Structure formats: structure tokens, C-alpha cells
Amino acid sequence: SPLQQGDLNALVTSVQSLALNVNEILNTVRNLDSRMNQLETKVDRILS
Amino acid sequence: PLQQGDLNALVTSVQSLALNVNEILNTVRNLDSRMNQLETKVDRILS
Amino acid sequence: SPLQQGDLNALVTSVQSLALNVNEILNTVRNLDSRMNQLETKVDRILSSQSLIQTIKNDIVGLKAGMATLEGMI
Structure with missing residues (x-):
């Protein structure tokens, strides 16, 4: 199988x-603002 | 299959x-x- | 058939x-920090x-003390 959903969904999540x-x-920066x-x-x- | 071992760079x-x-x-914490x-x-x- | 890594490359760019x-x-936000x-x-x-400014306000309370003292008679 090609490059599978491991790294894919890792970087996606x-x-x-x-x-x-x-x-x-x-x-939080809006609070700062x-x-x-x-x-x-x-x-x-x-x-x- | 593909030879795309160069995805670890984008992962890290x-x-x-x-x-x-x-x-x-x-940043926002030090500014606060x-x-x-x-x-x-x-x-x-x-x- | 499963799709290919066009998803990979385009989404990468x-x-x-x-x-x-x-x-x-x-x-720019480190600069802003x-x-x-x-x-x-x-x-x-x-x-x-x-x-x-606190020192000068103390000087002024001393000055009002002094002005009251001097004014006491004339």
C-alpha cells in the first residue's frame, strides 16, 4: 500500500x-486587546 | 509503491x-x- | 482503487x-513582545x-504648613 493514513491523520489532527x-x-489576545x-x-x- | 520518505519533514x-x-x-501570556x-x-x- | 497523494502534494503546498x-x-509578534x-x-x-511627584506633594504639604505659620500673624 502507498503512504497510509498514519502520518496523514497525524498531521491533520x-x-x-x-x-x-x-x-x-x-x-486570549482579544482579551488582551x-x-x-x-x-x-x-x-x-x-x-x- | 511510492517513495515519498520526505513527509517526516512536514510532520515535524x-x-x-x-x-x-x-x-x-x-506571547499573549507575557503581554497580559x-x-x-x-x-x-x-x-x-x-x- | 484507493486515491493517490495528490491530496498529499496540493494540501502540502x-x-x-x-x-x-x-x-x-x-x-512580528515576537517583535511586538x-x-x-x-x-x-x-x-x-x-x-x-x-x-x-510624591516627593513634590510632600513638599507642598510642607509649604502649606509654612504658609499657615507665616500667615498666623500677618
Whole structure:
């Protein structure tokens, strides 16, 4: 048989779970974005 | 059959990709940590 | 008959084009980590400056004490 589904589904599950993981990453960075909007509003206040 | 022994490179590459996702996790974590630092700073300022 | 590794090769070039973009974002986000650390450094600097601000507010409370003393008579 040719190259079988071993490495195939190995890399496939890898990239799929880690793509949903990248999604969770960008959600955490969205939390980061919100908190940096907060801090930047405070710094705009103090600069005013 | 096929002679495509060169797939191990791409396999370890997608593993390093897993490490890359965990590394952007470390990224957002360190940014959140320095953010907590500066938010304590701005709390001090507002006080 | 089972399919062949056209699935392998085309999907390889696709996932590799996307993974290099992931790694490019990783490069720029390490740069952004360094820049955010520098922002944290500068913010700590300005907070050390607001420590001189604390010293000056203590100077002002001393100054109001002195002004009350001098004003006491005339």
C-alpha cells in the first residue's frame, strides 16, 4: 500500500486541534486587546 | 509503491506549528502579565 | 482503487503557505513582545517619575504648613 493514513491523520489532527488552538489564542489576545483599550483610555485621560 | 520518505519533514513541521501555537500562547501570556503590571501602575496614578 | 497523494502534494503546498504566514505573524509578534516590554519599561519609568511627584506633594504639604505659620500673624 502507498503512504497510509498514519502520518496523514497525524498531521491533520495536529493542524486542526492547533488551529482551534490558534482560535483560542486569538480569543486570549482579544482579551488582551480589550485590556489594552482600557489602559490606553486611562493613558489618554492622564495625557489630557 | 511510492517513495515519498520526505513527509517526516512536514510532520515535524506541523509539530513545530503546535509549538508555535503554544508560543503565541506564551506571547499573549507575557503581554497580559506586563499589562497587569502597567494596570497596577495606572491604578497607582489614579490614586 | 484507493486515491493517490495528490491530496498529499496540493494540501502540502497549501498548509505550508499558511504555516509560513503563521510564522511571519510569530516573527512580528515576537517583535511586538519586545515592544510591549519596552512600553512596560517606559511606564515603570514614568511611575518612578510619579515618585518624584510624591516627593513634590510632600513638599507642598510642607509649604502649606509654612504658609499657615507665616500667615498666623500677618
